[PDB]
Structure formats: structure tokens, C-alpha cells
Amino acid sequence: GPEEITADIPNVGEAALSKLDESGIVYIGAEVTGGDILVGKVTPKGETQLTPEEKLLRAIFGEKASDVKDSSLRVPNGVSGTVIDVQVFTRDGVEKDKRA
Amino acid sequence: VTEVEIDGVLHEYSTKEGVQEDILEILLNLKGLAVRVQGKDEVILTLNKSGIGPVTAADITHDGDVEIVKPQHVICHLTDENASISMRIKVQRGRGYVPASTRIHSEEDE
Amino acid sequence: EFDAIKIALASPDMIRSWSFGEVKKPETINYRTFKPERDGLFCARIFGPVKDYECLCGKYKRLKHRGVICEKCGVEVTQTKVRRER
Amino acid sequence: PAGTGYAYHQDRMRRRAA
Amino acid sequence: MNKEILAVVEAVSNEKALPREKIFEALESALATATKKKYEQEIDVRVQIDRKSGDFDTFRRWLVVDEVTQPTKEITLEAARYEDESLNLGDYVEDQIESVTFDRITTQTAKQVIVQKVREAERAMVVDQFREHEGEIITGVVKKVNRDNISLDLGNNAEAVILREDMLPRENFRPGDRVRGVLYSVRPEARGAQLFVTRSKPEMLIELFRIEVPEIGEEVIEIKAAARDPGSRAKIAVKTNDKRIDPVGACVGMRGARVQAVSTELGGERIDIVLWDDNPAQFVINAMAPADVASIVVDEDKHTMDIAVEAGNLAQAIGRNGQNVRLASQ
Amino acid sequence: VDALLDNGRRGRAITGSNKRPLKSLADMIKGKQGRFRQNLLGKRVDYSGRSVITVGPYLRLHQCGLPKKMALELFKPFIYGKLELRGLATTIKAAKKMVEREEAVVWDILDEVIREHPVLLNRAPTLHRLGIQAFEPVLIEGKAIQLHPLVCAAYNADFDGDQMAVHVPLTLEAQLEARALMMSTNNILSPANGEPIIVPS
Amino acid sequence: ATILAEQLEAFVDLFDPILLRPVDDLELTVRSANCLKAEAIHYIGDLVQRTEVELLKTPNLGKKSLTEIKDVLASRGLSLGMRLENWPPASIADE
Amino acid sequence: ARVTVQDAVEKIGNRFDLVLVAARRARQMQVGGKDPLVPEENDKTTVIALREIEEGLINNQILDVRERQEQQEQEAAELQAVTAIAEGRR
Amino acid sequence: GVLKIVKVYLAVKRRIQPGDKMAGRHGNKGVISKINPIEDMPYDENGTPVDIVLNPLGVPSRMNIGQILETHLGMAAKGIGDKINAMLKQQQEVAKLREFIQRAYDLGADVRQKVDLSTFSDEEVMRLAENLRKGMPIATPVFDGAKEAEIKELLKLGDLPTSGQIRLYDGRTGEQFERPVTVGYMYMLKLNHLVDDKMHARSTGSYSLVTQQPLGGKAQFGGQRFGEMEVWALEAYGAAYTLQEMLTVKSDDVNGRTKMYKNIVDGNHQMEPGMPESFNVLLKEIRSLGINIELEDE
RNA sequence: UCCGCGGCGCG
Ligand SMILES: [Mg+2]
Ligand SMILES: [Zn+2]
């Protein structure tokens, strides 16, 4: 399945996930340092096995993602500064988010 | 000066309409501006200006004690008919030289 | 641990003794399912499993098993470093 | 068997492999 | 409608192992608490979730107290004139009612909230078979290693933990061994509820009186008092039920058929039990074996006895470490 | 079979990419970029760093400068060992978070651990025996390596932007080798001839 | 040192924001205007003058205002026992 | 702190054996350690050995004899403990 | 095979620090040594402290004598520039300014320049004097440059010593240097070889797949390469244990470093050597072709 | 990125 650019990342805190917008793209003009998340990206893991936790949570929640791997980038260690400009390119035939 | 609050700006590297020079030039020019503080320690200034022409520090809205020593120091250059900028300048007193990198050491408010 | 390095020609018998199986297909890897199929440049029985302590067909998954061979896919159960030796 | 290890290497040669 | 709560309740491999309403009672409340934690308002949430037809909703509790506890949806005497005088301290009525919360962020925090909820749900069924017998023959195979104790990945949908004084100190319940004893107090251990195997206390060491002898479990041999060391040695009074016969081989097995089998699962040690008979003098002389009896006497005017034995070859009769005479008075 | 066993020997049957002679089992051993000279004699190592050279006159010749960042990144296993003994944390994850937070309670520990712990130094074109030395480092703020001037004659290293690499010995055998032979004070005569090397330049 | 000191001897020179603000800055919805705005309380301290039990002076608030009433408690100035003198509390003095 | 090694080189009539003997001594000091023979200067065990070698009381011939003495005493203690355990039940 | 791509830009205001590289325009390279406070700099009699203290001993060896003459000429360039700033500070009238500029442009020999401020303007001359406050620029085509006489005449036009060497004062002592020191205005550059793009360390990180060594490069946390000649350098020395650990424990053996990293935390500092897996892989490639190879015995 | 070639630049 195609990757998602959602603003949800497991096993991370909201202190780092505060600058990032709900659309998944960092705010224009926000000072960041090494290790911070710029854009949130997750990938479809593929189930291949239904654990009892996945047996219980998937049906009750109504969302059947249900636990996927992340592929978000982060600022490389050593470099910091400000994010002056963000560019978004999307192919034709696919819907665009509000930021684009 | 320590921090400024240019109204319609988002980051240090962008620009604005009407103002002749960049924001970076504005800050480089403004960091050399000298003031005097007597009673308080962290006074906050305010600048409002419209019209076409040069803009100096003399139009800074003064306070009970804040005294400018070089009122003929240029800051920006207003060329457009309607490009009124509004900034809030924070001034605190101290000693020595403090870079901007050390100021990020707080990590509760920035 | 060791005292000398001996080098000589290799018999076909020694080659067959080294080889844990044979390779008859030019297949590299199956598409749309990133797993290796039967005998080829990559395989499961010929060179060992891909995932550690995990057979190709998922028949047996626990660390205590050692040397057991499944019937759907005949492989042993040990960490993948054996791929560097077989 | 050149530097410090020479003393160790001599010990293995004389005590073992004999 | 939810159209999936019924399937969750009738999966039913995991739902029917516990009570059928457990998923709709405890798991639903835990999910509501997780959703409230993922929400900005710090208000207590009660999940009115049923698996009958999918009528699952959430409600915001009032938390009627004399303070501002749970201030997001707090209640107090501030509504006494408006809530028909419902002012109290401790009431937790439902002030409001939520509609739905998908909460994809809570789906990410599932590994911290719903994982623990599922662990508690599994522990609920684990405790139903860990020590539900309130003390009986409970066995355990050791497959895990834990610090300051002995772990065992045994059955009964739970684990097992043995303390230093619970199992045999010489051979703890570690990889390559097994235990079998009795336990009744099993609380929620790490990673859910766990059982307990203690094959060193009296309930396991003295339980061999009806598990090793061939004529004691049918009430034909006098087995009523037994004090022994934990998994090291045992010296009990093997007597007959007023039969005046030689009982030295009854509780110890014919030709030593039970000495090495009384505590085979408790560590496999050697024991030396004492004999007795129907004669009070002979029983008193032989209850402290090995004791070199030199005289026969008995005292009844005071709450005391008289151990009339020698000490040359009977160092255990006087008591050096509590080997033979320590269980004699019992 | 000829192309597999030794590609390019007879027919150069490559057809790999657009005019690209592809390798072989013979080519993967022999040559400059084969197996021997690539990954059996000169082998990449852990516990290393690289930075720019800077002169310092205020420090004695048996000790060299070292920045805080390189020292803290190199001695991370040492920091974990000393911190656990003092009981500041309990698990390795807590110690890793403590290092990641660079709190004030780790700089003093790093000062304790480096008091008698020599480190190695060498230039990239190591040409003779004196091209590698050891020094007992002194923690200094900055981003370069401070270095005593006189020993710069040994390296034949000027200051136009030359770069050095640092390696850290671990075991008692290696540290004792460093202190007994690798130090600057132990090599004051050249192996080539008896003239000194600490000659004022 | 004393010598240098001698050479410099003649030379050296040796509160409650709610109780202090009107009701226009409160965090309450407009549906509960009957409880506070229409009960002769033009200041936030007048609404904060009632404690956690005295805040039942007006039962005209709607069902949805009950949740909005708890929203005042989230500001740590209402529904917890605050008692203003008349307008301001004891800790809201500007002296 | 120590700056040179020349004193230890003068003491032991070789430089290469010095590393081995000091490494054995310092490893004995660190893991399974006992008290040092010199009042320390809150320095690591790497340099403590070199101070002892130049002090003229520790070398390869002293260290191995001390090791033989301590292992003989430990074996005698093991035999005594075995006999005492055997006599405990008697 | 990709859905959508997003790009972000990062702006770093990278400032100056020790470990950079600056140079003039004559190959006089240099790496910044230490930034001192303003007071510690040598300062001339009029208080103004110098900003760069170069080493003159690199002049006669590298022979680039042109930079000294550039310094001397540049020092004279500010002499006219500073004096112009002196008259304009007290708002001197135009006739005193213009004539002065006519005296600066007409010096030297019969140069090809011929400038007449008598015929431009008044406001234009005022603006030109405004733009000359920071220093009057000087042009010099390559193979016809001004000789000693012209620069001496330019220096004398101000109020500066002819020799170009003034007396300084050390900030640490306050004692005059017993010999004159050459000062002047040099054009200096800034190079991209920054220190923070080079400094990187590595405790433990990733590992390659075909053979177990740490990677290289500042990216992906590479490790510096123990060079082939460094093996010989250690070999000439007596360190055998150092080389053993260097190419056995910290680099290659998976059982080595994993067990070593467990011992290094618990105070223990002992290695456990094994077999380098790079040599093992090679063994397979030797056994692969047609020839038997194996380790003989214990 | 980790698999490889080519370029430019530093010492
Ligand atoms: Mg150079
Ligand atoms: Zn399988």
C-alpha cells in the first residue's frame, strides 16, 4: 500500500510533535534542531499475522490500519536553523491536501 | 535590543511589501541602536509609522524614562504609499557580549 | 584455535560435501511477495531461512526448536548468519 | 610475534607444539 | 450501529474464555479512559458500551464532590439549586454523554494504554486458574529467568514466581527443573497475574504423608503431625492408627520405597523418619530417633515433657541444628 | 563459465551497463579495490573521529587538546560504566537519555574518566614511524584539536587546513602500550638517525 | 594590595486575575448568560465571589451550561471555593 | 600523574616485558582487586602499576611468586574448608 | 513508483569560530587559532586596536612579497578615507571638500585618469564624499602597478609616517614594543571549508551487510579508516595488543565487540579475540572457485 | 544512504 503523510507517529511524544501541523508538514518559520521531525510519514506494514491484540482492537476501533511502521524523516544530527520554505509536488489524478 | 516583533513577518529570512531592504538588513541595522534604561530592566518599545520616506528612531513611542541618544539613526525606508510597519522591540540591560545561540538555553518559552 | 592454512585442489566429492542442496533455476526473488521461492540463487532449503528462527511457511515460531524440519518447506531453525556459511 | 606479543608467542612455541 | 461489538464478544476464542460481558465492561471503560486521555479535557469517561446490538456510547462523569476534582466535568453544590439538591461528596453520576471518538492518536498510544488494558483483561482470566483452588497440588515447569526469584512460563494462562524461601533453596525453579506444591495467595504480578509454586513449605513437604505411603491415604496409618526442614531432610513420626504394628516402613516405603520419592518433585532429598508404636513409653523413646534412650519417664503435672535419652551417639536427641528431636515434641 | 571465473580475460563478455566492465570472483580479490588491500589490511574501526588542527602554546608537550563534542561521543561506553556505578541511573536507557540530555552531572564524570586515559593521533599520509603518536587529552571548548607546536615537526604538518583522526585504546594492555611507547616524550630521537625531533622550528 | 587600595581610596564610590477583571474576560459560553450576566454580575469577581457551594444563586443555566460551568473550573478561579470581598478577593488587592 | 617510563625501563632490564608485567599487575588490581601498595592520588589503575614498578618492589619475579603463594594458601584453605564441612556432620 | 514528493529548506546562520580557514589574495593560508577579547589585541597610540595578527615569518620563505606592499597601500587608502570622515563629522562646507578630492586624484605621475570635481555638481560631490567615508578605493592594473614613490606620496598626503610602520602597545603588558610594527588594511576572504562540516565522531552505529565493518563518511555515522600504513607504523612500534584489538575487537568480529561492549560497561577492560569475518568471507570466495582451503587443526 | 562508476575540490 502507498505511504501516508499523516501527522500521527507511534512511540513519540507531543513535545516533539507540537510544531508539526495536523496536515503533516512543519510550520513555515519554526526553529528546529537535530532529531526533530519535519514531516510525518508512515508505511503500510502488512499484517501477515493476527495477534490477539489485533483481534480485539481492530474490530472495536473501526480502523484497520492497524499498527503500521513509520517512515518519517528527521533533521540530521548537527544541523539546525529555520525552515524558510516548503515545496509540495503531487502527481495528477491524486487528491491534494489543504497545504498544497 | 534583544528581540523584535515585526508584525506581518513569519521568520527572519522573509521580506515585506513597501520596505526597501530585507528583514536581515533591518535587524543588522537595528542591533546597533543605543538606548538608555533607568528604572526598569526589561522595558518594551513600540514603533508605528506610515507614509513615504525614510524612517528614523525619533518616532519611537517613548515612555516615562526611555531616552534615545541618536534620534537620527535610520532603520528602514518606506517607499510604498500604504506599507505601514508596526514593531515591538524588547530591550534588557546587562554586561559583556551574549550571542543568539546561548539565548536558546531556556527551553520553556521559545 | 588454528595453526596452519592448507591450500590444494578441490575434488567433486568435497564440493558435493560442502553443498547443502543444488541450484537449478535462474530465479532471484519472487515479485509482489518479497520472499524467496524454491531452489534458485536464493532459496530456503538450499541456503537456510531468511528470518531468524522462522521457517518460510511459518509452521514453527519459537526459539527452543533446533534442527526440526517442516514438511511444507524443509528448513532448519537458527539465526540467519548461517546464510554466510552454507 | 614482533612487539609485545613476541614474549607471548615464544611461550606458546616452547610450551606447546612440542 | 457499531456492528462489530457482537463479533468481538462472539469471536469467541478470547472473549468466551473470560466472561462474555468482560469485554463490554472493562475493556470498553479502559478504551474510554484512553480516549479521554487523548482528549484535551481531563474528565472521567464512562463507556456505556454493549455488544448486544452495537449501542456503544461514552458519557462524561460528574464527579460530584466538595472540591474541583476532575475540573473538566466536575460537579459540586454549585448546582444544588439546579439539580434538585443532588449535592454530595463522592457521587460519580454521568453529567454529559459523548457520541463517538475514533482517536487515531489513541490508536497510536494503544501500545501504552490498550496494551496494558489487554494485559489486565488476560490477567483477569489468569487469576481464575492461577490459585483458584485456595491451596492444592499445583505444579509448574520453569522456562524463564527472573532476578531475586525463580520464574516459570507455566500454563494456566499465567506465569509463576517462586521466592527464595518458597521453592527449594538448593535447587530453585530454574531452567532445567520443575516444582510442585501448594499456594493460595496469588496477586497480580509483572505482565499480568501469575501463579505460585512453593515446594518447600509444610503444605508440600508434609503432603507426602498421603502421597508416598501406601497405607496412609486410606486412613490406616497415623499421619497427623510432621515438622521438617525445607527440601533438605524430614524426620516425622511414622506411626500406625492404633494398630501396634511396625510402622517404620509404612510412611518410608517398603525397603526404602518412599524415602527418595516423598519430595522427588520438591528437590529430591533423603529423609530419615522416626518410628512409633501404641505403647506411650516406646513411642516417646522412638519419636526422637536417633535417640539413645536410657530411662523411661513421663510428666503430667505440668505443661512439659521429659526427654530421657543419652547424648553420646544421640547428638540429635539433645539438638544441634534441629534434625531429629525438633519434630519429636510435635 | 569463463566470464564468471575471470571476467575480461578472453572475451570481455560484460554487457552489464552502458560500457561498464563488470566485476568477477577473480576481480573481487585482486587489485587496489579488491579484498586484501581494501578490507583485510586497512580495516575501518570504531571509536574514532576526525577534525581540523589548531596550535596551542599553553599546554605541555605530553598532552593535547580535545573538543567536548568529540570526547563525549567517543567515550560514551566509558560514561555508561562510571555513571551506573555511582547510581545516578539504573538502566542503560536512562543513562542514554542522560547523555542525550547533556545535563550538568555528566561533564564532571567525563572529567573523572579522562584523567589518565591517553588517545592516539595520526596524519592521513602516515609515512614513517613518527606519524602516529599518543597524548593524554585535556578537555577544551571549541570544535578543533589543540596541539603542542614542537611535535608538529614530527608530523611534517603545517596549519593550512590539515585534518587529524583520533583513535581510543580500551584495554589495559593497549593503554599501557600507549603510556609506555606511544607518548610524545618517549620518542625524541628519530629511528632514521640520532638527531632530535623536538628541534625548535 | 593595600598600596593599590590606598591609591583608590579617594577614588572609589563605595494575585487573582478573575477577581481584578470584569466578566467580559471570562471563559464561559453565551448560553449561560442568565446565570451570571443576567444576575446583576458585571464583573468576573462578582461571579467568582461565590464558592463551590454558593454558585447556585441562579438555576436558569441550561443543560449544556453545566459542562460550561465546569469549564470555569478549568481556569482555577471558579467552582473551587473563591470568595471575593465585594468585587475582588483578598489576594486580588492592587495596593 | 606520570610523564615518563624511563624509571621503570631502568628497573626492569627490558621495555617490552614491562608492559606485560604491569598489565598483569593492573588487571589483578582492577578486577578481583586488592589494596594497592602505594597511597593513590585518585588516579586510575592504569598508572598505579607504573608507579609501583619504579618504586622497586614489584616485578615479574615478585608477582609470580606472590601468585604462587596466594594460590597455595587458597588451595590449603579449600582443603581445610572441605575437612571442616566433612567434620560438621560428624 | 512514487506518489508525491515534498521538499523543505533549512537556513543556517553559520558564524565564525576556531578551526575555519581564511586567506588573503596571495596564497597566505591560515586556520583561525583563538578569538581573544578586544583589549588583549595590540593597540596603537590612538586606541584603535588591530583585528588580525598574522605571522610575518611565512613571507620570506613563500616569497609572496606582494602582500606587504598591498598592506602598505591599503593603509594609505584609509588615510584619505578617515580624514574625509573627519571633515564631514563637523559638517564641513562643500568648497573645502571638493578641492581636497581634487588633490587626491591628481597625485602620482601622468596617469591616464583625469577627474574634475569642479564640473560635476554640489549635491553629487556631497554624495561622493558620503560614499568615501569608509575608505577611498584604489585601482591597480596588473603589470603597471604603482611603485614606491607613488605610494609614498599617497601616504604623505594624509598625516601618516612615510615608512608605513608605527609603534604599537601590547594589551597584556602596556609596554611599547622596542621595534616598529607594520600595520595596514588587508582584504581577507572566507572559505567554505568550515570546521563543523568536518568534525564527527562515532562510538557505535550501523554496519555493512556483505562484511562486518563500520561505514565511512560524515553521513550515516561513518568511522575513520585505520589506514594500511598505520598498520606498519604500529608494527614498527612495539604495540601488538593495540593492533590486535584495533583489527579484531572494535572493527570486525561480531562475537568480539558484542561481548566486549558488555564487559566495557561493568568496569572490566578485557578483550575476547575471535576470527575476523572479513577473512572468513574471503575464505568462502577462495573455496568457491576450484580450490580447497581450510584451517588445519586446533 | 548500505550496491557500484564518473566528475570537482581539500590536504
Ligand atoms: Mg598542509
Ligand atoms: Zn515454514
Write phi, then psi, for F77 (nearest 5 degrees). -60, -35
CATH 1.10.150.20 corresponds to the domain G15-89 = yes
Separation between Cα atoms, residue F197 and residue F155, nearest integer Å: 10
Q: How many CA atoms lie within 13 A of E76 on its CB side?
A: 24
**DSSP classification of residue A24:** S
Neighbours of chain F (3+ CB pairs under 8 A): H, I
CB I238 to CB F177 under 8 A?
yes
Same domain, I225 and I141: no
Tell if the CB–CB gap between I7 and A2 is shorter than 8 Å: no
Question: What is the fold, at CATH topology level, of the domain defined by E4-126?
Answer: N Utilization Substance Protein A; Chain:P; domain 4 (3.30.1480)
Instruction: Write down which residues 139-178 in F have CB closer than 7 A to strand J.
Output: 158, 160-163
Cell numbers at I46, concatenated: 590612538
CATH topology of domain A1-94: OB fold (Dihydrolipoamide Acetyltransferase, E2P) (2.40.50)
* CA/C1' separation I220–J1 (Å): 7
Residue F40: alpha-carbon gap to chain centroid: 18
Grid cell 528612531 in the structure block, residue: B57
Interface contact H90, partner F, CB < 8 A: no
Give the DSSP per-residue string, I150-184: HHHHHHHHTTS-TTSEE--B-TTT-PBPSS-EE--
Q: Which residues make beta-bridge pairs with F65?
A: F138
Distance of CA I212 to the CA centre of its chain: 38
**CA E289, E295, E297, E303 torsion: positive or negative?**
negative
Q: What are phi and psi of F122, to 5 degrees?
A: -155, 150
C-alpha–C-alpha distance, residues A45 and A47, integer Å: 6
Q: What would you measure as the largest C-alpha separation in chain G, in angstroms?
A: 84
Q: How distant is the Cα of H19 from the closest Cα of chain I, in angstroms?
A: 9
Q: Between β-strands F48-55 and F163-167, what pairing exists: parallel, antiparallel or unpaired? A: antiparallel
Q: In whole angstroms, how far apart are CA B91 and each of B44, B68, H11?
A: 6, 12, 69
Of all ligands present, the nearest one to the C-alpha of C70 is 2
Report CB contact under 8 Å: G61, E82: yes
Q: Does F129 touch chain I (CB under 8 A)?
A: yes
Lookup: cell for E300: 503430667
- How far is Cα C38 from Cα E96, in angstroms, rounded to an integer? 62
By the CB < 8 Å criterion, does I15 face chain A?
no
Q: Is the CB of F39 under 7 A from strand J?
A: no
Q: In the block, which residue shows the cell 474541583? A: E68
Q: Hey, are the CB atoms on C3 and I280 less than 8 Å from each other?
A: no
How far is C-alpha E115 from the chain's CA centre? 25
Q: CB neighbours (10 Å) of residue I229?
A: 19
Contacts with I246 (C-beta within 8 Å, 6 or more apart), sequence order: F45, F167, I226, I234
Ranges of H-type helices in I90-222: 94-105, 123-131, 148-157
Q: Return the residues preceding each gap in chain C, C–N over 2.5 A, or none.
A: none
In the stretch 177-216 of chain I, residues with CB closer than 8 A to chain F read 193, 195-196, 198-204, 211, 213-216
User: Chain I residue with minimal CA distance to D9?
Assistant: I240
- From the CA of C60, how far away is ligand 2's center (Å)? 7
Residue E93 contacts by C-beta under 8 Å, 6 or more apart in sequence?
Answer: E61, E62, E64, E75, E86
Beta-bridge partners for E59: E46, E97
| Overall CATH class of domain E127-203 | mainly beta
C-alpha grid cell for residue E47? 463507556
Q: Which residues of H touch I268 (CB under 8 A)?
A: 30-31
Nearest of I70, I263, I81 to residue I183 by alpha carbon? I70
Q: Do F44 and I198 touch (CB under 8 A)?
A: no
> Which residue intervals of F40-179 are DSSP H helices?
68-74, 76-86, 92-100, 107-113, 152-155, 172-177
The answer to whether E76 and E65 have CB atoms below 8 angstroms apart is yes
Cα E64-E65-E67 angle, rounded to 5 deg: 125
Task: Look up residue E130 and give its three cell numbers.
Answer: 492461577
User: Neighbours of A (≥3 Cβ pairs closer than 8 A)?
Assistant: B, E, I
Cβ contacts (< 8 Å) between D8 and chain H: which residues? 20
Domain that holds residue B10: 1-110
Q: What one-letter code names the amino acid at E188?
A: P
Q: What are phi and psi of F135, to 5 degrees?
A: -145, 150
In DSSP terms, which residues pair with G22 in a beta bridge?
A: G43
If one counts the domains in chain B, the total is 1
Element of type H or E holding C66: none
Find the Å distance, CA of residue I220 to C1' of nucleotide J8.
23
Cell 585518585 identifies what position?
Answer: H42
Q: Rounded distance, CA F51 to CA I200, Å?
A: 7
DSSP state of D4: T
Q: How far is the CA of F144 from the centre of ligand 1 (A)?
A: 16
Please report residues of I whose CB lies closer than 8 A to that of D7: none
Residue type, F69: K
* A86-90/B3-4 β-pairing: unpaired
Residue of A nearest to B14 (CA): A84
| Contact by Cβ (8 Å): I68, I186 | no
Contact I238 H15 (CB under 8 A): yes
Chains I and A contact (Cβ–Cβ under 8 Å for 3 or more pairs): yes
In the block, residue with C-alpha cell 534604561: B37
Contact residues, chain C, for I275 at CB < 8 Å? 1
Please list the residues that pair with I2 across neighbouring strands: none
Residue of G59, G61, G80 with shortest CB distance to E67? G80
Q: Is A52 on the interface with I (CB under 8 A)?
A: no
CB under 8 Å to B57, separation ≥6 — which residues?
B33, B68, B70, B71, B72, B73, B75
- Of the candidates I149, I77, I73, I156, the residue with the CA atom closest to the CA atom of residue I111: I149
Give the number of residues written for chain D: 18
I155 and I221 co-located in one domain: no
Residues in chain F: 201
CA separation, residue B26 to residues B14, B31, G7, I134 (Å):
11, 9, 47, 20
Which stretches of chain A are assigned E, i.e. beta strand? 42-43, 69-70, 86-90
Residue A8 with chain E: CB contacts under 8 Å: 104-105, 107-108
Quick check: A82 and B104 CB within 8 A?
no
CA distances from A85 to A30, A80, B23, B101, I7 (A): 11, 15, 16, 22, 8
Residue E215: how many other CB atoms lie within 10 Å: 14
Contact F143, I18 (CB under 8 A): yes
In the block, cell 446565570 appears at: G35
Chain breaks in chain D (C to N over 2.5 A) after: none
In contact, A36 and A27? CB cutoff 8 Å: no
Closest CA to F177 of H69, G8, B36, H22: H22
Q: Summarize chain A as % helix, strand, coil (round to 5).
A: 10, 20, 70
Separation between the CA of I259 and the C1’ of J6 (whole angstroms): 42
Nearest ligand by distance to the CA of F157: 1
| Distance from C-alpha of B47 to C-alpha of B87, rounded to nearest angstrom | 5
Question: Taking a C-beta distance cutoff of 8 angstroms, is the pair E72, E49 a contact?
Answer: no
Query: How was this model experimentally determined?
Result: cryo-EM
Q: How crowded is residue C67: how many other Cβ atoms within 10 Å of its Cβ?
A: 7
Whether residue I239 sits in one domain with residue I95: no
| 3-class SS of residue F80 | helix
Contacts by residues F26-31 (CB-CB < 8 Å, ≥ 24 positions apart): F26/I289, F28/I285, F29/I282, F29/I285, F29/I286
C-beta separation of G27 from G75 below 8 A: yes
How far I282 CA sits from the closest chain F CA (Å)?
7
Instruction: Return the ∠ at Cα F175 (arms to F172 and F181), rounded to 5°.
Output: 130
* Same domain flag for I147 and I114: yes
CATH number of the domain enclosing I150: 2.40.270.10
In three-state secondary structure terms, A44 is coil
* CA C83 to ligand 2 centroid distance, Å: 16
Distance between CA atoms of H46 and H41, rounded to whole angstroms?
12
Task: For residue E191, give the C-alpha cell.
Answer: 505482565
Closest among C56, C58, C69, C61 to C30, alpha carbons compared: C56
Task: Name the minimum distance, in Å, from the CA of F189 to any CA of chain I.
Answer: 14
Chain J nucleotides near the protein (CB, 7 A): 1-3, 5, 10-11
- Resolution (angstroms) stands at 3.8
Residues E131 and E182: beta-carbon distance below 8 Å: no
Scan residues 214-253 of chain I and list those with Cβ within 7 Å of strand J.
215, 219-220
- Separation CA E185–CA E132 (nearest Å): 9
Q: In terms of residue numbers, what domain contains I153?
A: 15-198
Q: What is the CATH number of the domain that holds B110?
A: 2.170.120.12
User: Taking the C-alpha atoms of E57, E58, E62 and E63 in order, what is their torsion angle to the nearest 10 degrees?
Assistant: 130
Four-point Cα dihedral E100, E101, E107, E113, nearest 10: -90
Contact criterion met (CB below 8 Å) for B57 and B73:
yes
Measured in Å, residue F134 CA sits from the centre of ligand 1 at 21
Quickly count: other Cβ atoms within 10 Å of residue E279's Cβ. 12
Beta carbons of E276 and E284 less than 8 angstroms apart: no
Contact E163, E182 (CB under 8 A): no
Question: Is C57 assigned a ligand-binding role in the annotation?
Answer: yes
Same domain (yes/no): I145, I222: no
Q: Is A58 exposed, middle or buried (0-12, 13-18, 19+ CB in 10 A)?
A: buried
